[PDB]
Amino acid sequence: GGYMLGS
Amino acid sequence: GGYMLGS
Amino acid sequence: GGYMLGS
Amino acid sequence: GGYMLGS
Amino acid sequence: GGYMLGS
Amino acid sequence: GGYMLGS
Amino acid sequence: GGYMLGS
Amino acid sequence: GGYMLGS
Amino acid sequence: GGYMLGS
Amino acid sequence: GGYMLGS
Numbered sequence: 375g376g377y378m379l380g381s
Numbered sequence: 382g383g384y385m386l387g388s
Numbered sequence: 389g390g391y392m393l394g395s
Numbered sequence: 396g397g398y399m400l401g402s
Numbered sequence: 403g404g405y406m407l408g409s
Numbered sequence: 410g411g412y413m414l415g416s
Numbered sequence: 417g418g419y420m421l422g423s
Numbered sequence: 424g425g426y427m428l429g430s
Numbered sequence: 431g432g433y434m435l436g437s
Numbered sequence: 438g439g440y441m442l443g444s
Contacts, residue, residue: 376389377433380401381382382401386404387433388389389431391440394405394415396411396417398426402404408417409411412419417425431439 375432376384376386376388377435378384378399380384380399382404383393383395384399384401384407385393385435386393387391387435389433389439391442392407392413394407394413396409397424398407398417399407400426403416406414406419407411408419414419415420
């Protein structure tokens with residue numbers, strides 16, 4: 375899997 | 382803001 | 389994998 | 396692929 | 403300001 | 410490939 | 417892909 | 424896909 | 431494999 | 438292999 379975070 | 386992506 | 393971070 | 400935009 | 407990413 | 414822009 | 421920005 | 428924004 | 435993030 | 442980042 376993996377991940378993505380943002381603002 | 383900003384961002385972070387990873388696997 | 390790998391990673392990417394930015395602002 | 397894709398796109399990410401933030402402001 | 404902000405950010406734009408595409409792949 | 411792709412692109413990344415920030416300001 | 418690619419991008420275009422203008423004012 | 425893609426995107427278009429304008430004012 | 432996997433990922434671990436903390437802040 | 439892999440990666441480790443800290444700040």
